[PDB]
Ligand binder design. Sequence first.
Ligand SMILES: C/N=C(\NC)NC1CCN(CC(=O)NCc2ccc3[nH]c(-c4cnnn4C)nc3c2)CC1
Length: 105
Amino acid sequence: SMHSDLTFCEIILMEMESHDAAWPFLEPVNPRLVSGYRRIIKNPMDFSTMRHRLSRGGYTSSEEFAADALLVFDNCQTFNEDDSEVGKAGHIMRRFFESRWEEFY
Ligand SMILES: C/N=C(\NC)NC1CCN(CC(=O)NCc2ccc3[nH]c(-c4cnnn4C)nc3c2)CC1
């Protein structure tokens, strides 16, 4: 399971999930609601997947955790227009994540 040295990542993820702009990213992009996603996006990522990977020992390091966070935001900018609701949310969340990351380090 998660090593205690990564508790700061667990907290950042919890705070991301609680944010106003997190709604598009809480769960895997859902084919019932969004068409054509995996056609474009080779490596989907979302906060629930991250939460499980982190809590069960799937991230050895904070760098691996951060890489998945950035994958959420990179996928969002690949799939969505910048002025779409989801596109705007991705930019908000990237800034929020980077601020919290820099605050710890
Ligand atoms: C906290 N709730 C908010 N606060 C502003 N507003 C909601 C209002 C209702 N309504 C729902 C909606 O639309 N449910 C479909 C859905 C859900 C998750 C998605 N995730 C992506 C996505 C991720 N990456 N690319 N996409 C295209 N599309 C999604 C579509 C919008 C949210």
